[PDB]
């Protein structure tokens, strides 16, 4: 009978196993920490775990899989005296964890006879086990395998098959000398113990790098990896500097006779032998007109040899121009090697040294180290040649070959091992490109087509995403494949140039552009692809009325704050891209959460009245202001350079417009012109920012100084008049927030703030720190942001970035006013921080058998989370991190309106819904991942155990694998606004059975009966657990027509007029058999030590006194017809005296009366004298009463309800006056929120139930009408509080019965035409629970 046995730290050598065998109820067997020598022989008991560690057990019996095969999962016999392992221990299906560590096991049983398909952890370390032979099936289950200090002379052959391992520990096996290549296939394995092992097949360097490098190298061995000598080389430089001439000299080795004509990109395959003894270059001669200067940069890739061609005789301006190219290469190809090669050497001795000094000054800072943002140029990377005499040609070739063999990833590029499958894919892609070129086909290759290529390739072992991605990176490195996948750079260049050759005001209608684009084929079936990459390069962007804006076709040139940006050099087409991006963003104007790099321009929301865009400027007239940006020529420190003059006029000091430009400028300079992010070799920025002095009126404040002062102070004094300071608000109104309402700003004098580690509540995704603080005495969460000429520049950049991020976060937080979203109290600049409302309790992950928080609280939490998500998605905001860490618990009180709030501190909508499903799993379970990407989901118990079928089903859908099937947050919110969602617990399929019975107890909660005569049997359902404790236990005898439970005795009245009594201790042997004059049709127990009344089929009532559950064989007979004739003067001919059976009885008036049916009438038995004293006429013949209940609950008058069979009518009397004070029709097709007064086939009701305060009327249709009484203007009335209907029971037939099995449970039992029975379990909500449920939605709607 015992469930948990804990024998530990005691005098245990011999265990009374026979005594333990009686414990059939055990779930945990713990005999650990003893000197146990004889483990008890296994027995039938549903053990979940078997802890027998730290004892003297030497051997086990072959009986684990005889009794515990289907129950026992956790076994740990570790650190014992074990010598032999039974075969049966591995024959347990339920086994998932096994520990046989620290003993004298020498061999394992044959693998063919194992059954433990669920074995996930197996530790055989510290043993003499040996080489061993593991089963194959363990590959699909095992996650942890450890064999440390085993009798192994090699890796077991089966370890290579164990694809599912995450840990593999085989240390201290000195006989092992090999790690076979197939272990590389263990892709899921990242924890390894190869200590004390010899590895002859792995280099020492690979071992030093680690077991991860070992697995990678073994994979390389398996894939027959070959040494590749192919690398990308790119010629770049200013136009007409001899790029084609230089390449011709390099390839031919002669004075050029044919130089290539006009072209943007040309390609060739150049082969060199040593002056791993050869190399091959996929040479891309990149040239073209000046208009391609900032488009060609897309073709620059990493781990490639760049040759910047430079005209030596042109002068110093050429060397200065080289900075542009060098910055571009270092920005796009950080790990590339750059050589600067000089031509026109025939036009020049010391001049060469001077020019080399100039170039070396460019690449290196004054300190001599590598300048930031430049490639590593040195004396080895410089060379000069001529175009006729070929001087230095051989030296140049030697330089190329030497640099190529020097570049390395781990070893040198020229000869690195690549998997053979990667080379096979390279051949396949080259074949595809060649075929498309032959067929004049679109050279753009779709991802599906590349997958088809890699799979279609013979014996290509690329079978997963990571392999294909690595192969893609390799292909990009060798100039075979291009991505921004493209196969032909020349075709792309031709397409872009042809678009550039088009000659409106920059906007062309989509159809006109489609016909114009016909030159490069432009297959309409590929148009969606084609236009896509047109948008990628910003060559033709979709705008307005399904038109396309063409930046190269922009027209020419047709109180306040001002800004200036000084540019040393203007990139070609910078203005076009800038104006196009601004114009498109404004046209859009007419997000994320929890911190990320993803965000939109939420900073600027105004009505654009007029817009004037042109080749080098944009003027925007918006309601209450102007925003203009123009080209200009700036002069500072007598340095004249290009410039961007920006002006804004705001009537209300709303200078958010100056953010809109500035952010965009930064964005553009970060995306397409990274050259302008960098500084010269001496630290001078290539693009500087300036603010004209408004009080000096030209004098310009350096924007870095204004920003750095804005961190702490408010004023700056100009050098021309230091005694007359200017506030920063007239210099940088962007940073000092002015657009926000005045109410939104915190008062530093009323804010108790301190960046104390003890008050740290957490961190955000943007790099902030959230502390606990006080504002005006109330607790709050304060999110604080945190931040030599080079150090000053870096700090200024960081400060500007933080101010922009603060602006964006404030803009998004200001727009969320939903009750379930953490609001914003206010902002402040000194210090730069947010103030937010603080949760009295910690996050949901911290407060958290099943449903730990309770049903109602879990329901409210889930609904409020869903409502918050629906609101966020209504604002086009995505949470992106919807974990329980970020979900703050406001209160665990069920009565409160708001319980949780969604925070940003501790894609599209489908990922949010997925994370919501995970949160629901945690809510139902109490706990809780790469396997999620593979279709593996966390496991939750069945509905019979969870007991919340609808939320569990919702959680399954939220965790679905196809995003298309997942629900929208609004749909979840809408379907949760329904009492069916909350009340239904689960369903239980009992199956084929005959009759249903219940009793006011828990020993015989729900009892079904089936069978006939010798085959009579019964089933018991434990609805509290959803488990059937007895299933068709046979108790031969007559079938039971009625059943009751009194004290601890079950009375059952059969069809042969016999009341049998079974005393519980199995209803096998009755103790009493009582005779009756007619078949019992109903039972009741009056609490008098009881008085059991039996309503017989003839309308007569039998009365049995009961003493402690045992009655007297004699009984009294109270005749209803006798009372009708004698007391109440009803004639025999009256229909009221027809032979009706007693259908339902009920106690009323605290046991002093019993109301029981008699045809359409009702009779009252007065318990004082056991006589029929009152009659009531709720209905008329031939109708009959079918149920009676006593709604004796609440601070009010006791009332008695009565249902009917024909009229389908409900009536209610007062128990103390017998006045028919209410009548209602229950056959209402749409009964929701109906009403009736009180005066002080599928629509047929089955049986009334009294659930706490309310009256549940189930109907054959399967739904339930939950009627309850209230008062209006002093008059009592009744209303239909809620109509429940579980859809899951639709195919389970018709409702037959219903019964209140416990205080908080209502069991409605359905039967189908095939004699099968099915229970539907509802939570027995009273009036207060329903009102709380409804108010949870009504109030949040109101708020
Ligand atoms: N004198 C001299 N002329 C050169 C040299 N390299 C190229 N050229 C001239 O440049 C022309 C070809 O330039 P090209 O290679 O097409 O420049 P790219 O378009 O940038 O590749 C030829 O007509 C040559 O006369 C050189 O080293 N010395």
Q: Which atom of ligand 1 is nearest to the CA of 245?
A: 15
Question: Whose CA is closest to 1318, among 1300, 1291, 1299?
Answer: 1291
| Contact present, 91 and 113 (Cβ < 8 Å) | yes
Sheet holding 1220-1225: strands in order across?
1185-1190, 1199-1204, 1209-1214, 1220-1225
Nearest residue (CA) to ligand 1, atom 11: 242
Q: Is 386 in the pocket of ligand 1 (CB under 6 A)?
A: yes
User: Which structure tokens are listed for 580?
Assistant: 């196009």
* Secondary structure of residue 265 in the 3-state scheme: strand
- Phi, psi torsion values for 1176, nearest 5 degrees: -130, 150
Token pair 């270059």: residue: 281
Cβ within 8 Å of residue 1308, ≥6 positions away: 1258, 1262, 1264, 1295, 1297, 1298, 1319, 1320, 1321, 1322
CATH topology of domain 554-683: TATA-Binding Protein (3.30.310)
Tell me which of 387, 389, 391, 392 to substitute to probe ligand 1's pocket, judged by most ligand atoms within 8 Å of the beta carbon: 387
Cβ within 8 Å of residue 921, ≥6 positions away: 928, 938, 940, 955, 959
This structure was determined by cryo-EM
Q: Is 1019 in the pocket of ligand 1 (CB under 6 A)?
A: no
Return the half-sphere exposure (C-beta side, CA atoms, 13 A cut-off) of residue 1250: 16
Neighbour tally for 1001: CB within 10 Å: 15
Tell how far the Cα of 245 is from the centroid of ligand 1, in angstroms: 6
Q: Which atom of ligand 1 is nearest to the CA of 345?
A: 27
C-alpha span between 1278 and 1236 (Å, rounded): 5
Q: Resolution for this model in angstroms, one decimal place?
A: 3.8
C-alpha span between 224 and 737 (Å, rounded): 62
C-alpha span between 951 and 854 (Å, rounded): 13
Nearest residue (CA) to ligand 1, atom 17: 240
Q: Is 1328 in the pocket of ligand 1 (CB under 6 A)?
A: no
C-alpha span between 1040 and 321 (Å, rounded): 104
**Exposed / middle / buried, residue 2 (Cβ in 10 Å: 0-12, 13-18, 19+):** middle
Token pair 């097949």: residue: 201
| Contact present, 686 and 676 (Cβ < 8 Å) | yes
DSSP-assigned beta bridge partners for residue 565: 644, 689
Question: Whose CA is closest to 1138, among 1197, 1182, 1179?
Answer: 1182
Question: Whose CA is closest to 352, among 391, 323, 388?
Answer: 391
Neighbour tally for 209: CB within 10 Å: 14
| Contact present, 900 and 890 (Cβ < 8 Å) | yes
Tell how far the Cα of 246 is from the centroid of ligand 1, in angstroms: 8
Is the preceding omega at residue 1182 within 30 degrees of 0, hence cis?
yes
Nearest residue (CA) to ligand 1, atom 24: 242
Question: Whose CA is closest to 295, among 158, 126, 484?
Answer: 484
Q: Is 240 in the pocket of ligand 1 (CB under 6 A)?
A: yes
Neighbour tally for 1087: CB within 10 Å: 11
C-alpha span between 928 and 918 (Å, rounded): 8
Tell how far the Cα of 280 is from the centroid of ligand 1, in angstroms: 25
Q: Is 698 in the pocket of ligand 1 (CB under 6 A)?
A: no
- Taken in order 237, 238, 242, 243, the sign of the CA dihedral is positive
C-alpha span between 890 and 837 (Å, rounded): 10
Nearest residue (CA) to ligand 1, atom 3: 344
Strands (E) across 1099-1234 are located at 1101-1107, 1110-1111, 1116-1118, 1145-1148, 1153-1158, 1161-1166, 1171-1176, 1185-1190, 1199-1204, 1209-1214, 1220-1225
Q: Is 243 in the pocket of ligand 1 (CB under 6 A)?
A: yes
User: Residues comprising the binding site?
Assistant: 239-240, 242-245, 261-262, 344, 346, 387-388, 761-769, 783
Q: How far is CA 33 from CA 39, 51, 82, 85, 516, in A?
A: 13, 9, 15, 20, 86
C-alpha span between 847 and 1139 (Å, rounded): 63
* Secondary structure of residue 721 in the 3-state scheme: coil
C-alpha span between 543 and 1085 (Å, rounded): 82
| Contact present, 1305 and 1022 (Cβ < 8 Å) | no
DSSP-assigned beta bridge partners for residue 1255: 1250, 1267
C-alpha span between 47 and 968 (Å, rounded): 42
CATH for 226-418 is 3.40.50.300
User: Residues comprising the binding site for GDP?
Assistant: 239-240, 242-245, 261-262, 344, 346, 387-388
Nearest residue (CA) to ligand 1, atom 7: 242
Q: Is 239 in the pocket of ligand 1 (CB under 6 A)?
A: yes
Query: Mind spelling out the 3-state secondary structure of 181-225?
Result: HHHHHCCCCCEEECCCCCCCCCCHHHHHHCHHHHHHHHHHHHCCC
Strands (E) across 657-805 are located at 687-692, 700-702, 715-716, 726-727, 751-752, 760-763, 769-775, 778-784
Nearest residue (CA) to ligand 1, atom 15: 242
**Exposed / middle / buried, residue 1019 (Cβ in 10 Å: 0-12, 13-18, 19+):** buried
| Contact present, 214 and 194 (Cβ < 8 Å) | yes
Q: Is 387 in the pocket of ligand 1 (CB under 6 A)?
A: yes
Tell how far the Cα of 970 is from the centroid of ligand 1, in angstroms: 67
Cβ within 8 Å of residue 1112, ≥6 positions away: 1104, 1105
Tell me which of 234, 235, 239, 242 to substitute to probe ligand 1's pocket, judged by most ligand atoms within 8 Å of the beta carbon: 242
**DSSP per residue, 1247-1271:** --EEETTEEEEEBTTS-EEEEEEEE
Tell how far the Cα of 61 is from the centroid of ligand 1, in angstroms: 91
Separation of CA 474 from chain center: 32
Q: How far is CA 823 from CA 672, 813, 817, 882, in A?
A: 38, 7, 7, 17
| Contact present, 1049 and 1130 (Cβ < 8 Å) | no
C-alpha span between 721 and 715 (Å, rounded): 13
Render the burial of 631-666: b for 16+ CB within 10 Å, e for the rest: beebeeeeeebbbbbbbbbbeeebbbbbbbbbbbbe
Q: Is 343 in the pocket of ligand 1 (CB under 6 A)?
A: yes
Q: How far is CA 1314 from CA 989, 1246, 1261, 1340, in A?
A: 13, 20, 18, 46
Q: Is 346 in the pocket of ligand 1 (CB under 6 A)?
A: yes
C-alpha span between 603 and 469 (Å, rounded): 37
User: Which structure tokens are listed for 544?
Assistant: 């307005």
For the stretch 498-503, contacts whose Cβ atoms lie closer than 8 Å and that sit 24 or more positions apart, written own/partner, are 499/534, 499/539, 499/540, 500/291, 500/539, 500/552, 502/550, 502/552, 502/553, 503/553
Tell me which of 245, 286, 310 to substitute to probe ligand 1's pocket, judged by most ligand atoms within 8 Å of the beta carbon: 245
Tell how far the Cα of 170 is from the centroid of ligand 1, in angstroms: 65
Q: Is 643 in the pocket of ligand 1 (CB under 6 A)?
A: no
When the candidates are 3.30.70.2660, 3.30.200.20, 3.40.640.10, 3.40.50.11540, the CATH number that belongs to 743-837 is 3.30.200.20
C-alpha span between 1002 and 1045 (Å, rounded): 10
Q: Is 779 in the pocket of ligand 1 (CB under 6 A)?
A: no
Tell how far the Cα of 1304 is from the centroid of ligand 1, in angstroms: 93
Question: Whose CA is closest to 642, among 713, 566, 584, 578?
Answer: 566
Selecting among 881, 904, 1204, 1263, the annotated active-site residue is 881
Q: Which atom of ligand 1 is nearest to the CA of 288?
A: 19
- Taken in order 1258, 1264, 1265, 1267, the sign of the CA dihedral is positive
Tell how far the Cα of 343 is from the centroid of ligand 1, in angstroms: 8
Is the preceding omega at residue 434 within 30 degrees of 0, hence cis?
no
Nearest residue (CA) to ligand 1, atom 2: 344
User: Which structure tokens are listed for 14?
Assistant: 């011999």
Q: Which atom of ligand 1 is nearest to the CA of 235?
A: 21
Cβ within 8 Å of residue 349, ≥6 positions away: none
Token pair 């109180």: residue: 559
Cβ within 8 Å of residue 36, ≥6 positions away: 12, 13, 15, 52, 55, 56, 57
**Domain-by-domain residue ranges, the chain?**
226-418, 420-548, 554-683, 743-837, 844-977
Q: Which atom of ligand 1 is nearest to the CA of 237?
A: 20
- Taken in order 311, 316, 320, 326, the sign of the CA dihedral is positive
User: Residues comprising the binding site for ATP?
Assistant: 761-769, 783
| Contact present, 1079 and 1057 (Cβ < 8 Å) | yes
* Secondary structure of residue 1289 in the 3-state scheme: helix
Q: Say if 743-837 and 844-977 have the same CATH topology.
A: no
Length in residues, the chain? 1343
When the candidates are 3.40.30.10, 3.40.50.300, 2.30.30.100, 1.10.510.10, the CATH number that belongs to 844-977 is 1.10.510.10
- Taken in order 906, 907, 912, 915, the sign of the CA dihedral is negative
Token pair 């060397």: residue: 319
| Contact present, 1178 and 1211 (Cβ < 8 Å) | yes
Tell how far the Cα of 314 is from the centroid of ligand 1, in angstroms: 12
Question: Whose CA is closest to 867, among 509, 1339, 1313, 1225?
Answer: 1339
Our answer to whether residue 881 is catalytic in this structure is yes
Tell how far the Cα of 239 is from the centroid of ligand 1, in angstroms: 9
Token pair 């379990």: residue: 1321
C-alpha span between 1340 and 901 (Å, rounded): 12
User: Which structure tokens are listed for 542?
Assistant: 């979709």
Tell how far the Cα of 241 is from the centroid of ligand 1, in angstroms: 6
Nearest residue (CA) to ligand 1, atom 28: 344
């Amino acid at each position: 009978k015992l469930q948990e046995l804990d024998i530990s730290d005691n005098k245990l050598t011999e265990l009374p196993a026979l005594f333990l065998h009686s414990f059939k109820s055990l779930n945990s067997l713990n005999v650990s920490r003893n000197n146990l020598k004889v483990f008890p022989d296994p027995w039938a008991c549903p053990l979940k775990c078997c802890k027998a560690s730290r004892n003297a057990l030497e051997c086990l019996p072959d009986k684990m899989a005889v009794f515990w095969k289907n129950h026992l999962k956790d076994v740990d016999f570790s650190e014992n005296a074990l010598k032999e392992v039974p075969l049966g221990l591995f024959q347990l299906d339920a086994l998932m964890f096994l520990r046989l560590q620290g003993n004298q096991l020498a061999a394992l049983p044959p693998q063919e006879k194992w059954t433990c398909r669920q074995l996930k952890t197996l530790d055989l370390s510290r043993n003499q086990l040996g080489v061993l032979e593991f089963p194959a099936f363990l590959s699909e289950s095992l996650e942890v395998l450890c064999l440390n200090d085993n009798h192994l002379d090699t890796v077991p052959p089966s370890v290579c098959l164990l694809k599912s391992l995450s840990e593999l520990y085989l240390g201290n096996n000195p006989g092992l000398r090999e790690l076979p290549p197939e272990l590389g296939q263990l892709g899921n394995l990242w924890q390894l113990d190869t200590e004390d092992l010899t590895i002859s097949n792995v280099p020492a360097e690979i071992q030093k790098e680690g077991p991860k490098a070992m697995l990678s190298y073994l994979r390389a061995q398996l894939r027959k990896a070959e040494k590749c000598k192919l690398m990308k080389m790119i010629i770049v430089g200013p136009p007409r500097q001899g790029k084609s001439t230089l390449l011709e000299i390099l390839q031919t080795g002669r004075a050029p006779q044919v130089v290539h004509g006009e072209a943007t990109i040309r390609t060739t395959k150049w082969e060199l032998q040593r002056p791993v003894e050869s190399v091959e270059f996929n040479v891309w001669d990149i040239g073209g007109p000046a208009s391609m200067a900032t488009v060609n940069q897309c073709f620059f890739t990493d781990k490639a040899l760049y040759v910047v061609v430079w005209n030596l005789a042109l002068g110093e301006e050429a060397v200065a121009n080289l900075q542009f190219w060098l910055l571009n290469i270092e920005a796009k190809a950080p790990n590339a090697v750059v050589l600067v090669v000089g031509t026109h050497l025939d036009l020049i001795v010391e001049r060469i040294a001077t020019l080399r000094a100039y170039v070396l000054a460019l690449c290196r800072s004054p300190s001599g180290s590598r300048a930031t943002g430049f490639p590593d140029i040195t004396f080895k990377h410089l060379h000069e040649i001529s175009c006729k005499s070929l001087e230095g040609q051989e030296g140049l070739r030697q330089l190329i070959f030497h640099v190529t063999c020097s570049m390395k990833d781990c070893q040198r590029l020229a000869g690195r091992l690549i998997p053979r499958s990667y080379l096979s894919l390279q051949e396949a892609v080259l074949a595809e490109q060649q075929r498309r070129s032959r067929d004049d086909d679109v050279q753009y290759l779709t991802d599906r087509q590349l997958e088809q290529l890699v799979e279609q390739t013979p014996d290509n072992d690329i079978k997963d995403y990571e392999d294909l991605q690595s192969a893609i990176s390799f292909l990009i490195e060798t100039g075979t494949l291009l991505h921004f996948y493209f196969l032909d750079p020349i075709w792309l260049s031709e397409c872009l140039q042809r678009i550039f050759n088009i000659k409106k005001n920059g906007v062309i209608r989509a159809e006109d552009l489609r016909m114009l684009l016909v030159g490069t084929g432009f297959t309409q079936q590929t148009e969606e692809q084609y236009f896509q990459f047109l948008a990628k390069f910003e060559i033709a962007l979709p705008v307005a009325n399904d038109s396309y804006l063409l930046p190269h076709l922009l027209p020419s040139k047709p109180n306040t704050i001002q800004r200036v940006f000084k540019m040393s050099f203007v990139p070609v087409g910078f203005w076009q891209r800038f104006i196009a991006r601004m114009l498109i963003s404004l046209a859009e104007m007419d997000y994320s959460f929890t911190g990320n790099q993803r965000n939109r321009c939420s900073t600027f929301r105004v009505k654009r009245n007029q817009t004037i865009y042109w080749q080098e400027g944009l003027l925007v007239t918006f309601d209450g202001g102007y925003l203009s940006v123009e080209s200009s020529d700036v002069n500072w420190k007598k340095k004249k350079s290009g410039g961007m003059k920006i002006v804004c006029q705001s009537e209300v000091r709303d200078f958010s417009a100056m953010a809109f430009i500035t952010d965009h400028v930064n964005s553009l300079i970060d995306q397409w012109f990274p050259a302008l992010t960098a500084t010269e070799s001496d630290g001078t920025p290539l693009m500087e920012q300036y603010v004209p002095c408004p009080v000096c009126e030209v004098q310009y404040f350096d924007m870095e100084d204004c920003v750095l002062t804005a961190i702490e102070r408010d004023f700056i004094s100009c050098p021309r008049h230091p005694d007359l300071p200017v506030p920063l608000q007239e210099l940088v109104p962007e940073l000092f927030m002015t657009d926000f309402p005045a109410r939104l700003f915190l008062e530093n004098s009323k804010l108790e703030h301190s960046e104390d580690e003890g008050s740290v509540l957490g961190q955000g995704g943007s790099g902030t720190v959230i502390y606990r603080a006080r504002y005006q005495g109330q607790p709050v969460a304060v999110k604080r942001f945190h931040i030599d000429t080079m150090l000053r520049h870096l700090r200024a950049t960081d400060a500007m970035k933080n101010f922009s991020e603060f602006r964006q976060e404030a803009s998004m937080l200001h727009a969320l006013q939903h009750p379930c979203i953490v609001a914003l109290i206010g902002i402040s600049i000194h210090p730069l921080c947010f103030a937010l409302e603080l949760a009295p309790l910690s996050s949901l992950n911290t407060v958290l058998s099943f449903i730990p928080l309770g049903h109602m609280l879990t329901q409210k939490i889930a609904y409020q989370i869903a409502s918050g998500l629906a609101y966020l998605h209504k604002k086009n905001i995505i949470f992106c991190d919807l974990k329980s860490d970020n979900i703050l618990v406001w209160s665990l009180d069920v009565k409160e309106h708001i319980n949780i709030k969604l925070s940003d501190y501790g894609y599209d909508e489908k990922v949010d819904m997925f994370s919501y499903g995970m949160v629901l799993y945690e809510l139902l379970s109490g706990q809780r991942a790469k396997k999620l990407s593979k279709g593996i989901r966390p496991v939750l118990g069945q509905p019979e155990e969870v007991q919340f079928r609808r939320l569990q089903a919702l959680m399954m859908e939220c965790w679905d694998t196809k995003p298309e099937k997942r629900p929208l947050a609004l749909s979840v919110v809408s379907q949760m606004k329904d009492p069916t969602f909350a009340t239904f617990m689960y369903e239980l399929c009992c199956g084929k059975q005959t009759a249903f019975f219940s009793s006011q107890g828990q020993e015989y909660t729900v009892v079904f009966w089936d069978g006939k005569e010798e085959s009579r049997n019964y089933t018991v359902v434990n609805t509290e657990k959803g488990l059937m404790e007895v299933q068709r236990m046979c108790c031969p005898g007559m079938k039971v027509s009625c059943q009751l439970q009194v004290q601890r005795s079950l009375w059952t009245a059969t069809e042969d007029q016999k009341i049998y009594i079974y005393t519980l201790k199995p209803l096998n042997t009755p103790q009493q058999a009582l005779d009756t004059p007619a078949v019992v049709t109903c039972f009741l127990a009056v609490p008098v030590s009881y008085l059991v009344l039996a309503g017989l089929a003839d309308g007569l009532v039998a009365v049995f006194p009961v003493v402690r559950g045992t009655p007297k064989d004699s009984c009294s007979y109270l005749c209803s017809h006798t009372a009708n004739r004698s007391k109440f003067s009803i004639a025999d001919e009256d229909a009221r005296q027809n032979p009706y059976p007693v259908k339902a009885m009920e106690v009323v008036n605290s046991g002093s009366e019993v109301w029981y049916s008699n045809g359409p009438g009702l009779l009252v038995i007065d318990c004082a004298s056991l006589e029929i004293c009152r009659r009531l006429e709720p209905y008329m013949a031939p109708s009959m009463v079918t149920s009676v209940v006593c709604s004796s609950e609440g601070r009010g008058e006791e009332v008695v309800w009565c249902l009917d069979d024909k009229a389908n009518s409900l009536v209610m009397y007062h128990s103390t006056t017998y006045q028919l004070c209410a009548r209602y029709f229950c056959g209402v097709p749409s009964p929701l929120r109906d009403m009736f007064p009180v005066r002080p086939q599928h629509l047929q009701a089955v049986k009334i139930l009294a659930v706490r305060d309310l009256i549940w009327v189930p109907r054959r249709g399967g739904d339930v009408i939950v009627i309850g009484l209230e008062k209006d203007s002093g008059a009592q009335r009744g209303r239909v509080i809620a109509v429940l209907k579980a859809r899951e029971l639709t195919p389970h037939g018709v409702l037959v019965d219903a019964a209140v099995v416990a205080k908080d449970t209502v069991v409605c039992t359905f039967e189908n035409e095939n004699t099968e029975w099915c229970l539907a379990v509802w939570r027995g909500w009273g009036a207060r629970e329903f009102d709380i449920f409804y108010q949870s939605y009504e109030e949040l709607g109101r708020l």
